[PDB]
Design an enzyme around this catalytic site. Structure first.
Site, PDB file in Angstrom:
ATOM      1  N   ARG A 212       0.838  -1.191   0.000  1.00 59.90           N
ATOM      2  CA  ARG A 212       0.000   0.000   0.000  1.00 59.90           C
ATOM      3  C   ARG A 212       0.878   1.246   0.000  1.00 59.90           C
ATOM      4  NH1 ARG A 212      -4.545  -2.094   2.392  1.00 59.90           N
ATOM      5  NH2 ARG A 212      -5.092  -4.004   1.245  1.00 59.90           N
ATOM      6  N   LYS A 235      -3.426  -0.511   7.899  1.00 59.05           N
ATOM      7  CA  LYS A 235      -4.850  -0.644   7.620  1.00 59.05           C
ATOM      8  C   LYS A 235      -5.453  -1.872   8.298  1.00 59.05           C
ATOM      9  CE  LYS A 235      -8.199  -0.822   3.826  1.00 59.05           C
ATOM     10  NZ  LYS A 235      -8.389  -0.720   2.354  1.00 59.05           N
ATOM     11  N   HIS A 308      -2.473   3.716  -6.430  1.00 54.99           N
ATOM     12  CA  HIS A 308      -2.917   2.510  -5.743  1.00 54.99           C
ATOM     13  C   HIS A 308      -3.182   1.415  -6.767  1.00 54.99           C
ATOM     14  CE1 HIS A 308      -4.605   0.067  -2.592  1.00 54.99           C
ATOM     15  NE2 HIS A 308      -5.763  -0.038  -3.217  1.00 54.99           N
ATOM     16  N   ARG A 311      -0.723  -1.365  -7.251  1.00 55.17           N
ATOM     17  CA  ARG A 311      -0.837  -2.539  -6.397  1.00 55.17           C
ATOM     18  C   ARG A 311      -1.628  -3.612  -7.135  1.00 55.17           C
ATOM     19  NH1 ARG A 311      -1.649  -4.996  -1.656  1.00 55.17           N
ATOM     20  NH2 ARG A 311      -3.707  -5.895  -1.182  1.00 55.17           N
ATOM     21  N   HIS A 333      -3.316  -9.872   1.917  1.00 50.83           N
ATOM     22  CA  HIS A 333      -4.750 -10.127   1.857  1.00 50.83           C
ATOM     23  C   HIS A 333      -5.043 -11.614   2.031  1.00 50.83           C
ATOM     24  CE1 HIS A 333      -8.915  -9.964   0.714  1.00 50.83           C
ATOM     25  NE2 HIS A 333      -8.714 -10.687  -0.372  1.00 50.83           N
ATOM     26  N   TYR A 342     -10.147  -8.599  -7.875  1.00 54.44           N
ATOM     27  CA  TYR A 342      -8.955  -7.769  -8.003  1.00 54.44           C
ATOM     28  C   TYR A 342      -8.152  -8.273  -9.196  1.00 54.44           C
ATOM     29  CZ  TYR A 342      -5.623  -4.424  -5.975  1.00 54.44           C
ATOM     30  OH  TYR A 342      -4.830  -3.327  -5.725  1.00 54.44           O
TER      31      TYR A 342
END
Lengths: 356, 54, 274, 55, 53
Positions: A212, A235, A308, A311, A333, A342
């Site tokens: 991130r 996060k 972002h 990523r 994740h 994603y």
DNA sequence: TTTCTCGTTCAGCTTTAATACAATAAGTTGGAATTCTAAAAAAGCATTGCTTATCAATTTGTTGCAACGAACAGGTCACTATCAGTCAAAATATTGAT
């Protein structure tokens, strides 16, 4: 009283009067004093009329087609103030609490000052849909959710018995954030020459680590031990160790090779520092990445990608490069729901099928 | 959604003469004021009467 | 005042007209609303009891149409939920009921059955056979198979834009089913010689055909073959289900999913030694 | 996005005449003021007539 | 949407004098009760003369 | 003449895929405002015979502008009587016991 009615208040609202100097002053139902506001007539009355949004002072209310059910209670604008005193005790990070306040503020300038059992579901929908017609659909969803939890905590404190907000539906966003391919990647990195040097290094470092942008500006040269890159996401809180042997052939970028470049050119306590040898913010990094985007001249469909998005591009590349399970542990994740949401394209590239 | 002086008087509890409608605006007896746009007032969709007295 | 059920259902249809959905989709809901009209009296919403709602619902469940009861119950509920939003009533007497669980009774199609239908499609025109092999070699839905133009084919590919979901894929002209004896290439060229039109699948008049006639004529060859099943006889859409079932044992499972147009995952497993 | 003289007036609360709208432009009764481009005027999206008078 | 005093009494079976009808207003002998516009009363189309005692 | 021939939309049904429900934690993107900094402009550097300003002591015409005296606001306290709020007066309805 001494003066019930007059030939001066005859053209003035209940609050606000007029002195012997042709000036007007609005009373204060909290002390009995007043401040001078206005020299004209249609101005002092047109000013002492919106505070006058609350003559409860006589008048009642009723729309077209509706029922009746009420008695007596208190204000509500104040409840939005007591609700904030409860959210600050729920133990929340210093960033999420601000996200709630901004929404509560929107509720302030959205709904009229009103008791709590007065604001009908119809009134909440008029304000909610108002943001949808403007395009801001993702906002109406958060405003509704927040305004929904506010009444829930209200009912648990002996004030309301129902949750009218639960009656109305929530907008359904579609996420119009275009992705970034590998070709458009080099197009931006090439235009990042006019921008500082730390930009290109952090741009490749954000695609080789797939971390991130926030944690990308938190890594120091002390977090690297035995060839590993200890990174602690803020996060979620997940902890991972990235090997300094990674490499992206689709872009020709080596992990170790990129790291060393930030040790000579940049130099400092953090992997990615500024020209002044100091750590930067997470809002300035993705800021300059935009400049190179617009200066490029390339066009997309919808909303231009972001820092972002690197990523995401990092995950898609590592997929075909090594494996799928590899582009899952690196992104910090887990679960099995976003790993697929994603990898999609969202109307950009055709999902070609090969003989395999 | 804004309406005219004629369209507004048509959607009230009791439609009166256009003259009387213009009078209320001049006397500022409606929240919020119509605001003259050219040469014809434009009432707000929520602009209702208030009525004063002495 | 201004109440009543029907009066609301009229102001409800316009609401769904601004929801922004597919054409056919909006029609499906309308057919459900009309059923509610002749299913419940014309009286205020606050007067409608949960009993009358279940009396009409179960009435469609006993008739055999359990599936219809689910949609009508799910649609009638949405109307009231939007009715409360306007301030009409206070409660949704439909959220107290229970949807009837319906089990799919549409039998599947096998390899032997397909061969028996293709041969029985002789009496049928010369485009049905081509539509069969194509629907099984591409594994696409009947809806898009009719909107396929020869311009979609680009350098050995087959650009297909699914109407239902909207997924975009490209099926190469190199596929071939190893169980029935059909080749993607040999099938396409067979349509360019026999048919000959703007669309891969046209009529005898060299003109596009509707998706309602492709599966309609397929039914005639189904009952004409003389094959018995268990439940409801398979349809043309089953060719899509048969396609994947074959490609999963012909190539790979990850291939069947990408061919159909799926993205996410969602019988006799083997117990390995390890 | 910039609307024309006709397009802008065709989106107001009450469509007026072309010559009328031209008058406001000269009286600065259009905030913000349109921009000259070619031969016609280009108004702003959120352009709305105002009253530059305090009676 | 409403009906004037005359337009309401004219529809009645036994149209009484204006005064008498105005008296049934101050004595709340009419329900649903009429509202005062400016100088006249506008009853409801379903408003009836509820004679009690 | 009279008969052979296909595609559509309608309507009551059945089936295939994505998105669930909420509180939590940031991330993005158009500016706004303070401060660093290279870019510009005015000034010092540089100097000498010749040109122009330096100014007292006192009379006379001139004028900027503070010093005040009222009037129009500018802002706060009081006039004048009952609103604004809450408890008791006065005797029995209503409730409890004979």
């Amino acid at each position: 009283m001494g003066r019930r009615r007059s030939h001066e208040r005859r053209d003035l609202p209940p609050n606000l009067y007029i002195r012997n100097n042709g000036y007007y002053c609005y009373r204060d139902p909290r002390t009995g004093k007043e401040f001078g506001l206005g020299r004209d007539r249609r101005i002092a009355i047109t000013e002492a009329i919106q505070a006058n949004i609350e003559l409860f002072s006589g008048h009642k209310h009723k729309p077209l087609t509706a029922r009746i059910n009420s008695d007596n209670s208190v204000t509500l604008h104040s409840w939005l103030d007591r609700y904030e005193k409860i959210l600050a005790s729920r133990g929340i990070k210093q960033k999420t609490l601000i996200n709630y306040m901004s929404k509560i503020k929107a509720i302030r300038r959205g709904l009229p000052d009103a008791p709590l059992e007065d604001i009908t579901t119809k009134e909440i929908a008029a304000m909610l849909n108002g943001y949808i017609d403007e395009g801001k659909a993702a906002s109406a969803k958060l405003i509704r959710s927040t305004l929904s939890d506010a009444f829930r905590e209200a009912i648990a404190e002996g004030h309301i018995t129902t949750n009218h907000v639960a009656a109305t539906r929530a907008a359904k966003s579609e996420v119009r954030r275009s992705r970034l391919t590998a070709d458009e990647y080099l197009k931006i990195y090439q235009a990042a020459e006019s921008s500082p040097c730390w930009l290109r290094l952090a741009m490749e470092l954000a695609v080789v680590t797939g971390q991130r942008v926030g944690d990308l500006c938190e890594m120091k040269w002390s977090d690297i031990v035995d060839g590993y890159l200890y990174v602690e996401q803020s996060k979620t809180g997940v902890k991972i160790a990235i090997p300094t042997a990674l490499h992206i052939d689709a872009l020709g970028i080596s992990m170790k090779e990129t790291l060393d470049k930030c040790k000579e050119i940049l130099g400092g306590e953090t992997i990615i520092a500024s020209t002044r040898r100091e750590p930067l913010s997470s809002g300035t990094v993705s800021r300059y990445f935009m400049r190179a985007r617009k200066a490029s001249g390339l066009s997309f469909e919808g909303d231009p990608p972001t820092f972002h998005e690197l990523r995401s591009l990092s995950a898609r590349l590592y997929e075909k490069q090594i494996s799928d399970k590899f582009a899952q542990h690196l992104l910090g994740h887990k679960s099995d729901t976003m790993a697929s949401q994603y990898r999609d394209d969202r109307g950009r590239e055709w999902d070609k099928i090969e003989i395999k | 959604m804004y309406l005219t002086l004629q369209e507004w008087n048509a959607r009230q509890r009791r439609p009166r003469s256009l003259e009387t409608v213009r009078r209320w605006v001049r006397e500022s007896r409606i929240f919020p004021p119509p605001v003259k746009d050219g040469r014809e007032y434009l009432f707000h969709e929520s602009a209702v009467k208030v009525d004063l007295n002495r």
